[PDB]
Ligand SMILES: Nc1ncnc2c1ncn2[C@@H]1O[C@H](COP(=O)(O)OP(=O)(O)NP(=O)(O)O)[C@@H](O)[C@H]1O
Ligand SMILES: Nc1ncnc2c1ncn2[C@@H]1O[C@H](COP(=O)(O)OP(=O)(O)NP(=O)(O)O)[C@@H](O)[C@H]1O
Ligand SMILES: [Mg+2]
Ligand SMILES: [Mg+2]
Ligand SMILES: [Mg+2]
Ligand SMILES: [Mg+2]
């Protein structure tokens with residue numbers, strides 16, 4: 001048996017590898033809070049009356065620079081976002097770089113400058129790092145770890161029947177923008193990735209409704225909105241009913257996705273949060289998101305239900321329903 | 337200008353890149369304690385009356401499995417050791433893996449099993465991670481970040497005139513074992529890497545003499561003992577006088593290094609600590625090391641002096657002295 005590209009594609013195939021190989025081989029998996037067996041966006045560790053949150057992502061996106069972002073902005077954003085969706089204020093990042101021999105020095109400078117600019121948006125410092133250079137023809141991989149502090153960690157397993165399901169903005173932008181760039185699809189301008197840190201969006205909701213009323217979050221990265229909704233449903237042992245017409249999709253993204261033959265629900269987003277909130281606080285949460293720039297296109301897209309546990313239903317027309325199927329993998333190679 | 341293999345070799349060339357490109361491009365570099373500008377083994381962050389310590393290393397060693405270790409044992413050991421030489425008890429690791437398409441599943445399982453076994457030695461849990469798969473022909477890179485807690489962080493810049501300089505064991509084992517394996521050099525058995533976590537050694541000294549009497553530490557990884565001693569001297573603005581005959585070198589390592597034409601002082605070690613301690617506590621520190629298994633071959637090798645600031649002197653014969661020159665880079669490719 002061999003490792004396949006699908007094992008790195010964020011869908012069912014990767015999930016099976018994590019359950020059957022990673023979780024079964026590693027034995028020391030928790031430091032006292034949310035640990036590896038939870039397979040959540042990060043881990044938590046009790047510290048005083050708060051919690052340290054710890055997360056890591058490798059970044060292998062191609063090309064290194066793309067419309068709306070680059071591997072540097074992605075490395076900072078993705079790790080800040082995994083902290084944010086655990087309910088953690090980012091306090092420090094670590095920057096590992098693995099660089100291909102022969103890369104132009106200006107490319108490294110540009111990636112670093114983008115990392116710094118993006119970090120400054122949060123704000124969060126890059127306090128430690130590492131540099132390796134290999135003869136392999138890889139250009140560059142960037143691996144960021146993050147530490148945050150949460151007063152009240154938010155899991156991906158806390159959804160409750162009756163809760164509202166929100167997304168912080170348009171769906172499909174990153175993956176569709178990336179594929180469009182590769183394929184020479186563009187409109188008046190090129191479609192831009194949404195890659196950005198969204199701690200500001202999460203914090204805005206928390207300050208409005210309180211952490212206790214945010215029941216679940218995930219950032220819909222590899223394998224998309226569909227993967228994120230299916231995982232929350234599965235982990236929370238609930239069904240999720242989504243009204244398809246309420247999912248925000250940029251018109252240019254819809255058009256390009258049609259031309260590409262790719263579902264915008266199944267591709268990574270890089271500047272979004274899926275949030276599940278107490279029913280009575282749904283409108284306040286939505287308003288809090290929409291008051292921010294990065295959450296300006298936020299929408300309530302569905303609700304948590306007691307049946308179809310572990311499944312996601314898509315409602316269309318005047319009431320019809322079908323399943324939103326979780327992808328076997330993100331269909332966009334090297335999306336991340 | 338292009339990135340060269342030397343930029344990843346841990347010596348003067350890498351150091352110049354860190355000073356002239358990394359530190360000059362990043363602006364947010366500290367979270368309140370030791371930060372990026374210190375270029376120390378990790379960063380520190382005040383938390384309550386203690387300090388969170390944060391570090392990261394990428395691992396790109398070839399081959400993945402070698403005598404005495406593998407990329408998994410290396411990934412856990414190297415990051416635990418960077419925490420330990422900051423004075424931090426390891427509390428959590430993060431495991432990023434970037435895997436080449438086509439790698440045999442059994443290789444991944446073996447690396448994970450080695451990571452777990454090594455983590456169990458500390459003990460420290462692997463609480464979070466990431467998996468990416470690329471089509472590039474890389475086999476595997478493993479990137480570990482670590483969080484530790486220090487009551488009293490130890491810098492690489494705290495050496496004081498009069499202090500004793502210790503090493504926790506034999507010098508040159510990892511780099512020389514690796515090159516010997518590549519070149520088919522072996523004795524009755526193959527030379528083994530020393531790769532191992534050495535938090536136990538550091539902790540043993542601290543429990544004996546107190547953190548305040550441990551003035552500086554570094555693990556002598558890429559570019560070796562010479563690099564580590566030169567960096568401590570430079571950062572502390574002191575000279576270091578070393579008696580060459582007192583540096584422990586395994587007989588097989590000396591022989592192999594002669595055959596290879598490589599200095600054992602200039603190659604990475606992966607199970608060692610260089611420690612600078614208060615003069616009056618030198619013998620207690622040494623005894624504490626030698627009582628442990630991993631520190632069984634520890635030795636006092638020199639002393640900190642007021643002249644030759646930023647330099648390292650090697651004493652031979654009956655008193656003669658020359659400089660221990662810092663390498664431009666570790667001479668062993670893909671050592672780490
Ligand atoms: N190689 C690995 N070793 C240990 N834990 C892992 C590894 N790969 C993934 N995990 C864990 O598996 C879970 C799912 O990881 P992952 O899908 O990377 O999360 P994510 O970062 O939120 N999504 P993405 O940004 O697409 O990578 C998390 O709890 C990770 O900590
Ligand atoms: N790409 C990078 N970005 C930010 N900081 C970096 C980067 N590379 C190295 N650093 C910092 O530069 C200093 C020297 O790093 P490094 O030489 O990797 O330390 P080390 O881990 O103790 N030795 P080694 O195990 O051989 O890598 C540390 O303070 C790192 O945090
Ligand atoms: Mg996530
Ligand atoms: Mg992520
Ligand atoms: Mg390093
Ligand atoms: Mg170190």
Ligand SMILES: [Mg+2]
Nearest residue numbers: 393414418557
């Ligand atoms: Mg290191």
Ligand SMILES: [Mg+2]
Nearest residue numbers: 056057466467
């Ligand atoms: Mg990940």
